[PDB]
Amino acid sequence: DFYCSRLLDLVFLLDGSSRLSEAEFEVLKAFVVDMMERLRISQKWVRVAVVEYHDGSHAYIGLKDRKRPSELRRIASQVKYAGSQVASTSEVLKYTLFQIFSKIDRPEASRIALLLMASQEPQRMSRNFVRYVQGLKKKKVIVIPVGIGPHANLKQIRLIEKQAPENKAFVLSSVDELEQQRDEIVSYLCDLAPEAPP
Amino acid sequence: HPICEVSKVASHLEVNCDKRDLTALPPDLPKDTTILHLSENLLYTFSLATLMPYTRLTQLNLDRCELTKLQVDGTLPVLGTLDLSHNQLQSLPLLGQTLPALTVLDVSFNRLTSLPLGALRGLGELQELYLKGNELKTLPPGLLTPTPKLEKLSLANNDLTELPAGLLNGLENLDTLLLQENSLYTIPKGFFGSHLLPFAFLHGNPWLCNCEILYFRRWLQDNAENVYVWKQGVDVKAMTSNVASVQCDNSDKFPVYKYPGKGCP
């Protein structure tokens, strides 16, 4: 296991498409909970946010939400499975940019959006993908794509790694590989965010 | 402090006095306090002057209390965030002269039945304004002239019957406009101008589809992907792109964006 305390605002974006079974989705949410504990959201150092995205964006936890750990883990665990036909990564990103990271009430902590993707949105919806990804950059928001399975929008994952250097991506064959390279994902975040006290 | 929780996070000093059954501001709060949470307490009245000692305060939360009166005295030159939502205030406070640096104002779910002329004078740094869940029927002209930098405006769930034709003028940075769940039946011609508007919620309204709704319809077709639906649920708050939510008579039987208007010039 890998744990660490750091100044961070981490946003979990979860693919709500039918490319993942309900049961698989339950594994994805379990990964989010572990992540919350690993980064220790129990401290005022890390702020977490959780958004599920299919046609639209569904936020169950906001960064400035003031609730105790046990409560947040619950919400995260209760995020509803959508099993939707469409999961627009451009929508959730547009949402992250305008509705989550609009301002910078913490120019000290790192801002990271972990975009857990398992599908490929229709091209007709990706007209402003790069525009939004670029916007996130202008606001010091690092986007880390996590391709899950064979249907992850690889063109977009590449396009994200490209827009910024620190935008490193992870590719897992299935949600089961999640808990596999978790330490690897956590380790990379502790190297991106400034330190906090234990 | 023996009443509230204090925790310094970098260059910020946060004081949490959430749900402490407080009936008045706790005395002897750290002098460097930059963020104060007084939400969900038993405060029937509050005076801003009592915070002057904290020359570092930048955020103040007085939401979900029992506020029936708010005194606007002295000045908190560094405060940019004020949450007054979920109280019993019967009128909008005039803060332009007491809160110069204000960037976010929330007075949602109170008892506002109108907004005063020149209500936001002096609030030139205001970027966000939430007035959701009150009883506004109409808005005064020039309401947002003083706040040119506005990015997010919410008037959702009031009882608005119409909007001033020039309401959004000068707002070249507006990205979120929430006007859902009101009593609107038409949009004045040229209302939106040429400015791009990332998020606009227009559902829950009795749109009167006739020749006059044509301006709105052309706007809708050109902005189908910027028209959103706001859904609320248990722990979940969603925003979904869907132009068809905007409909005639408020019935899904016919979207406004696809209204013919046979003989309209």
UniProtKB/Swiss-Prot annotation, chain A:
Residues 9-185 form the VWFA domain. Disulfide bonds join 4-190. It comes from the Eukaryota. This is von Willebrand factor. The gene is VWF.
Swiss-Prot record, chain B:
Residues 1-31 form the LRRNT domain. Changing residue 233 to S/V: Increased binding to vWF. Residues 205-265 form the LRRCT domain. Glycans are attached at residues 21, 159. LRR repeats lie at residues 32-52, 56-77, 78-99, 101-121, 125-146, 149-170, 173-194. Changing residue 239 to V: In VWDP; increased binding to vWF. It comes from the Eukaryota. This is Glycocalicin. The chain holds residues 17 to 281 of 652 of the full protein.
